[PDB]
Design a binder for this molecule. Structure first.
Ligand code: CA
Ligand code: MN
Length: 430
DNA sequence: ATTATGACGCT
DNA sequence: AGCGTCATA
């Protein structure tokens, strides 16, 4: 009891931009602001595929991975912004550059781990200790947490949402013991103060709104972030975990949304995260392996130790294109033309990366899919990447994959290719 | 005929 | 190394 770790040593936040590609387009085009709108890629096939949706549009049932023509059936007034096309393919440069804007602001506050194009983890443990010493055991005012929800509160002995938020925050702050600098609840609270400041800086300096979660580890921070979107932040305390997890579907936890999570549910005959506490660590290891079992055993108790890695930049730079249905590449020169298109975009991004970040990729990965296959990827081969030249890279890509062709005729390609992928990897300092 | 990515684990 | 899993706009 004295020695049982509680996984409360760190303060971790996850900051996630609201409807990110939509906000990027709304900043650019004021006519889209405060409207049901979505971002789409391509247009010919069923109006294009939606990849981001404003909250106004979500209210009509518009979702990601919906065709625009179908979204227009739910929301006739839906406004659409198209992803840029370059060299015959969608080009995401505008959103990658907006991502860098936000990541650079966050980095002023602390070490961040880039987790996607629109979100990053923050280890706030040191920043919190410093702010605590400035504070001199002075109470934290509700005024410093103007957009913060405390998960699980209010509780016990107003019908409007902002009213409930303040009720919960007051109960939380009323309870706090600001006298103890080592108190995990106090540490989370100060972490939340800092994240309010970070989110205010992001909005001031970019125009973009975001949500955030604050907790003691990455999984809880990610879960917290989702609880009160958009434009709000949520503090999930160690103490809030039993109630939170008691009705939390297992698939909601990061890494459990796929096959492993489905197996936890099936094998154990349970539905909610909290139900995992009734198994021994060895039981969980027996079913799910040493690593997953130990992870699950601690995670269902609110404990996880995965560090926030100090990495602000992506580890790989890749370019890919699908060729679905009848557009599949059936001739050699088709294949070679697109390999060149991909390689030209890759060269452009790599050259920019080398100048910005002082590094060079050393490996080129080539991937394809074949019609009827499998699997998102059918085949993956690597070769050396020694010069940032598209023509060399595309010639090299063709070399490592040309034996995939089962056509006796070398002018034809069989089976037709439904995907091409070029990825640069293994960066070295330059 | 969601598409275009990007990280990490297994063997 | 090559494959598979899981994730995000
Ligand atoms: Ca987001
Ligand atoms: Mn995200």
């Amino acid at each position: 009891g004295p020695h049982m770790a509680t996984g409360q040593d760190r303060v971790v936040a996850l900051v996630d931009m609201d409807c990110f590609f939509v906000q990027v387009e709304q900043r650019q085009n004021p006519h889209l602001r405060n409207k049901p709108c979505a971002v789409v890629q391509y247009k010919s096939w069923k109006g294009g595929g939606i990849i981001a949706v404003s909250y106004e549009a979500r209210a009509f049932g518009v979702t990601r991975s919906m065709w625009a023509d179908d979204a227009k059936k739910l929301c006739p007034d839906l406004l659409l912004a198209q992803v840029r096309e370059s060299r015959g393919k969608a080009n995401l440069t505008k959103y990658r550059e907006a991502s860098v804007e936000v990541m650079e602001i966050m980095s002023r506050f602390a070490v961040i781990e880039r987790a996607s194009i629109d979100e990053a983890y923050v280890d706030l443990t040191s920043a919190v200790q410093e702010r605590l010493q400035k504070l001199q055991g002075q109470p934290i005012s509700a005024d410093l947490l103007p957009s913060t929800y405390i998960e699980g509160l209010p509780q016990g002995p107003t019908v409007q949402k902002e009213g409930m938020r303040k009720q919960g925050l007051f109960q939380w702050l009323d309870s706090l013991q600001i006298d103890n600098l080592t108190s995990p609840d106090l540490q989370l609270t100060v972490g939340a103060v800092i994240v309010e400041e970070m989110r205010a800086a992001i909005e001031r300096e970019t125009g973009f709104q975001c949500s955030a979660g604050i907790s003691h580890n990455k999984v809880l921070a990610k879960l917290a972030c989702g609880l009160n979107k958009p434009n709000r932040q949520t503090l999930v305390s160690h103490g809030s975990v039993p109630q939170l997890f008691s009705q939390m579907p297992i698939r909601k936890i990061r890494s459990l949304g796929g096959k492993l999570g489905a197996s936890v549910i099936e094998i154990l005959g349970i539905e909610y995260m909290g139900e995992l506490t009734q198994f021994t660590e060895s039981q969980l290891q027996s079913h799910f392996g040493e690593k997953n079992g130990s992870w699950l055993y601690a995670m269902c108790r609110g404990i996880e130790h995965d560090p926030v890695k100090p990495r602000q930049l992506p580890k790989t730079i890749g370019c890919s294109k699908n060729f679905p249905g009848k557009t599949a590449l059936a001739t050699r020169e088709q294949v070679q033309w697109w390999l060149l298109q991909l390689a030209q975009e890759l060269e452009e991004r790599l050259t920019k990366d080398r100048n910005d970040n002082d590094r060079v990729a050393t490996q080129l990965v080539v991937s394809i899919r074949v019609q009827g296959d499998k699997r998102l990827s059918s085949l993956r081969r690597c070769c050396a990447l020694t010069r940032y030249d598209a023509h060399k890279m595309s010639h090299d890509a063709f070399t490592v994959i040309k034996n995939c062709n089962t056509s006796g005729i070398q002018t034809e390609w069989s089976p037709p290719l439904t995907m091409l992928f070029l990825c640069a990897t293994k960066f070295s300092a330059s």
